[PDB]
Amino acid sequence: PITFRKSYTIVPAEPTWSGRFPLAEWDQVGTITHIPTLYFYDKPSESFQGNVVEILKTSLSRVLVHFYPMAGRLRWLPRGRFELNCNAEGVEFIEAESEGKLSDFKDFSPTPEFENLMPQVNYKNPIETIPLFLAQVTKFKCGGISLSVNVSHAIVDGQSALHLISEWGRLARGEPLETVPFLDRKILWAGEPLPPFVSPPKFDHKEFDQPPFLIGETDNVEERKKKTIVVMLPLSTSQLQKLRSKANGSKHSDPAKGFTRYETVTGHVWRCACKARGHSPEQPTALGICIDTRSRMEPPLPRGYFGNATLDVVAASTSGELISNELGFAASLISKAIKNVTNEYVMIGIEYLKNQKDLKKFQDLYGNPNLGVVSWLTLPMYGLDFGWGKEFYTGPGGDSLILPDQNEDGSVILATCLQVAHMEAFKKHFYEDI
Ligand SMILES: CC(C)(COP(=O)(O)OP(=O)(O)OC[C@H]1O[C@@H](n2cnc3c(N)ncnc32)[C@H](O)[C@@H]1OP(=O)(O)O)[C@@H](O)C(=O)NCCC(=O)NCCS
């Protein structure tokens, strides 16, 4: 319920480098729409006499000096490629008021009806009118505050978007940058040939293939149209210890290193989805894993590298093998697909994309029979202070998310997007068939 909405354009507070800015291959594939994050704050203490909206606008303007690419626009190039125009056209900031209360919210979680709180984007508009960054602050009726931030995956991954947001808070409190951004995407060979390969590369990565369809049909529009649903499913510390010890008992597990939380939960989720979808045993199925490459390259990417450095790697199996084998088998498929990602693997993946004739077939928003599990377990989300205090909740809006549980260290919450026809069976196996 919204009672006021007023929208402003924010440009950097000082002149900034202007011109044409080429993007890494990872910038131009996968998700190129906006990553949305929500932050909720309690009514500021009586101590606070600053101006909330003005603090936000002013510090955003100052932080855009150091992150000036965020203030630019995209422009299409030939062959599905695109680049950034650093033109300091600016970002959209919205100040809004509501006559709802913080206490009206049933609970806090990526949920719809929150859309009055998020700046909505019209992706059919011409590209040079679409800001890469949109923020909305909303004052509620009893003094609570909400802040949604929406930042293009076409120019950053989630790590770099949260870097931007964190520095925004720091500068609003008047203190210096924690991590200086490294902005030159040439370090990732943006718009440039890779070094020569010593040994010629074998282009055999699973993610180069297109994800399978359901065994009967020949394309996936029928599945794409079906009604889905998001449910939040907690996993307590002890449930995770059970799942993990069960997976480590399998001889596919690594000795001296167990399965991680991500590996275990993701294998469990893949098995549960397979059981719930009632596939024939031969049904191919692929699971997508986001992998941050920053520290996986040699040389590792520079500290504070600002851009997309995350790639989606695929593990694949059949529904019947996943269902019929123990949990450790599935987890070992996840773990093996992750351990494959060495420096050589990354460079071969970039070379593949450089040599593709059209990137449009790797862009825009997967589901049944396939799956994606995005780890949010290490993203520096928490403690964003502008300051009227830290937030009391923050979270994001075929993909499921593994979020940490901000109120019990080590516990997690799966944000699961599945078809309505399969959600009930999924929940049942998720807890029971532990
Ligand atoms: C692929 C990935 C998900 C695998 O995670 P993983 O299976 O936990 O394996 P890791 O090697 O990263 O970490 C092992 C353990 O040490 C911790 N850890 C290891 N390296 C770490 C690092 N560099 N920073 C923080 N924590 C780390 C992890 O939290 C994990 O702990 P857990 O088992 O208690 O959960 C992870 O490495 C990754 O790339 N994360 C990226 C998520 C992301 O960027 N998503 C947003 C995309 S827009």
CA distance 181 to 164: 9
Q: What is the dihedral of CA 414, 419, 425, 430, to 10 degrees?
A: -10
Q: Nearest Cα to 346, choosing from 187, 212, 210, 211?
A: 187
Q: Other CB atoms closer than 10 Å to residue 138's CB: what's the count?
A: 23
Residue 348 is classified by DSSP as H
Per-residue DSSP letter, 214: P
AA identity, residue 188? L
Q: How many CA atoms lie within 13 A of 294 on its CB side?
A: 14
Measured from CB, residues less than 6 Å from any atom of ligand 1 are 157-159, 260-263, 289-292, 295, 310, 338, 374-375, 377-378
Residue 183 sits at the vertex; the CA angle it makes with 180 and 187, to the nearest 5 degrees, is: 115
Ramachandran angles phi, psi of 341, nearest 5°:
-80, 85
Select which of 42, 254, 385, 405 is catalytic.
385
Angle at 157 between CA 393 and CA 375, to 5 degrees: 60
Known binding site for spermidine: residues?
Answer: 31, 153, 312
Q: CA neighbours within 13 Å on the CB side: how many for 22?
A: 12
Query: How far is ligand 1, taken at its centre, from the CA of residue 74, in Å?
Result: 31
CB atoms within 10 A of CB 242: 14
Euclidean distance between CA atoms 276 and 265, whole angstroms: 16
DSSP assignment letter at 26: G
Residue identified by tokens 């260290």 is 409
Q: Which residues contact 326 (CB under 8 A, 6 or more apart)?
A: 246, 250
Please state how this structure was obtained. X-ray
> What contacts 141, CB < 8 A, 6 or more positions away?
98, 99, 100, 101
**Active-site residue flag, 163:** no
Rounded CA-CA distance 336/353 in Å is 22
Q: How many angstroms is it from 112 CA to the middle of ligand 1?
A: 28
| Residues paired with 232 in a beta bridge | 415
**Cα separation of the two ends of the chain:** 40
Active site residue 385: yes
Strand partners, 7: 94
Residues 6+ apart with CB under 8 A from 429: 271, 272, 275, 276
Which listed residue (27, 34, 66, 153) is catalytic?
A: 153
Whether the CB-CB separation of 61 and 12 falls below 8 Å is answered with: yes
Nearest to 169 by CA among 14, 56, 45: 56
- Residue 282 exposure: Cα atoms within 13 Å on the Cβ side: 2
Residues 143 and 347: their CA atoms lie apart, in Å, by: 51
Residue type, 60: L
If you ran DSSP here, which 8-state letter would residue 384 be given?
A: -
CA distance 16 to 90: 12
Name the residue among 34, 300, 293, 37 with its Cα closest to residue 162: 37
DSSP label at residue 284: E
